[PDB]
Amino acid sequence: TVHIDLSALNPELVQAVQHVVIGPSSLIVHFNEVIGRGHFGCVYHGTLLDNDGKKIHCAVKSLNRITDIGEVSQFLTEGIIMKDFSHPNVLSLLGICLRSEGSPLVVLPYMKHGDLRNFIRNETHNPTVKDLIGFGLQVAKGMKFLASKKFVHRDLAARNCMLDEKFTVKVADFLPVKWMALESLQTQKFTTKSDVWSFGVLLWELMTRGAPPYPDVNTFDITVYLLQGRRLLQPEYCPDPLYEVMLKCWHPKAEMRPSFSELVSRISAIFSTFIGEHYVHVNATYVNVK
Ligand SMILES: NC1CCN(Cc2ccn3ncnc(Oc4ccc(NC(=O)NC(=O)Cc5ccc(F)cc5)cc4F)c23)CC1
């Protein structure tokens, strides 16, 4: 029972929130266990009673409160944006259950290992070149899926990719100038080819085990830096063929950049050549760098 006129939302718009709803008669939320509140909502640990037995772990997403109906359609329209995202490498929506008491919730599958960036930066973890390339391969597969749905991410980065118990990457979304294409920096226009550029930066984050891109650069003022004729350097443990792909992702002519289908293809080949014997270590010069 909220004190806001919600049905004044977008009928012939957000009516699909029903054929996706999952009655509270099966979802248990743990408001005491907070996994993390990014900035525009609190995320807790949750459980789902699948049908009449199967219980499953998950991450419940909720918002502040009354800042009007506008932001309620924003949190909903979005969660519904994931509804059609049926791909193993894309973070999906379990459903949306409604109490309407002052904060609707979106149910996501729990990601045991959190985000790809914190996971790889972890010194207790021991990824090989193969594992890191594999994570990158999984990201390209999800992006290949998203591009096919004509969905432009606009914010692809290791911090936005989630990792689950089976080590399956789920591309997700929790101005990032350092991941932006030259043409986007200049004309604020985002495209799939601009995601490919961000994917090239993401591969660099992976091979550097989460070092921040261009530490030394003004940020913004990245445009002037790139225009001087610069790109991120090849990480120590990055295979040449992979750096070559990174260089392609950062092509000056967007249309000249490989598609995500080509990226999956190219990267699956590179990945196939490694056996898991080359361990990737952290770079002394990147450590502690923000
Ligand atoms: N970097 C942060 C740090 C905290 N961490 C919280 C966390 C830990 C474990 N989990 N498990 C699940 N979910 C956890 O948080 C969340 C992680 C992602 C989302 N995403 C959305 O709400 N929406 C989308 O992703 C939309 C979208 C989907 C696909 C796209 F290609 C583009 C956009 C919501 C969360 F709540 C969590 C998290 C990553």
Q: How far apart are CA 126 and CA 188, in angstroms?
A: 38
Q: Which of 30, 35, 195 to mutate to test the pocket of ligand 1 (most atoms within 8 A of CB)?
A: 35
| Residue 159 amino acid letter | R
Cα of 169 from ligand 1 centre, angstroms: 12
Q: Is 85 in the pocket of ligand 1 (CB under 6 A)?
A: yes
Cα–Cα dist 215/212, whole Å: 6
Has 23 been labeled as part of a binding site?
A: no
Q: Is 5 a catalytic residue?
A: no
Query: Rounded to 5 degrees, what are φ and ψ at 32?
Result: -80, -25
Q: Tokens 């290791």 — which residue?
A: 158
Which position among 155, 164, 216, 240 bears the catalytic label?
155
Residue 219 token pair: 């940020």
162 lines ligand 1 (CB under 6 A): yes
For residue 216, give the nearest of 114, 125, 290 by alpha carbon: 290
Burial 197-218 (b: 16+ CB within 10 A, else e): bbbbbbbbbbbbbbbebbeeee
Orientation of helix 260-272 relative to helix 192-207, angle to 10°: 20
Spatial distance between the Cα atoms of 173 and 53, rounded to a whole number of angstroms: 31
d(CA 144, CA 146): 6
Per-residue DSSP letters for the chain? --SS--TTS-HHHH-TTTTTB--STTEEEEEEEEEE--SSSEEEEEEEEETTTEEEEEEEEE--S-S-SHHHHHHHHHHTTSTT---TTB----BB----SS--EEEEE--TT-BHHHHHH-TT---BHHHHHHHHHHHHHHHHHHHHTT---S---GGGEEE-TT--EEE-----GGGS-HHHHHH----HHHHHHHHHHHHHHHHTTSPPS-TTS-SS-HHHHHHTT--PPPPTT--HHHHHHHHHHT-SSGGGSPPHHHHHHHHHHHHHT--S--B----TTTTT--
Q: Which atom of ligand 1 is nearest to the CA of 61?
A: 36
Rounded to whole angstroms, the Cα distance separating 283 from 290 reads: 14
- Nearest Cα neighbor of 114 from 106, 125, 129, 104 is 125
Q: Is 39 annotated as a binding residue?
A: yes
- Ligand 1 centroid, distance to 115 Cα (angstroms): 8
Q: CA-CA distance, 166 to 266, in Å (whole number)?
A: 24
**Experimentally determined by:** X-ray
Q: Hey, what are 47's tokens?
A: 């459980």
Residues facing residue 47 across a β-bridge: 28, 57
The single-letter code of the amino acid at 174 is F
To the question of whether residue 150 is assigned a binding role by annotation, the answer is no
Q: Residue 130: CB within 6 Å of ligand 1?
A: no
Whole-number Å distance, alpha carbon 272 to ligand 1 midpoint, is 29
114 annotated ligand-binding residue: no
Whether residue 176 has its Cβ less than 6 Å from ligand 1: no
Domain architecture of the chain: domains with CATH: 12-110 (3.30.200.20), 111-287 (1.10.510.10)
Whether ligand 1 lies within 6 angstroms of the CB of 35 is answered as: yes
C-alpha 239/C-alpha 51 separation (Å) is 47
* 70 in a labelled binding site: no
State whether the beta carbon of 91 lies less than 6 angstroms from ligand 1.
Answer: yes
Taking the mean position of all CA atoms in its chain, how far away is CA 210? 14
Compute the distance between CA of residue 106 and CA of residue 134 in angstroms, rounded to an integer.
29
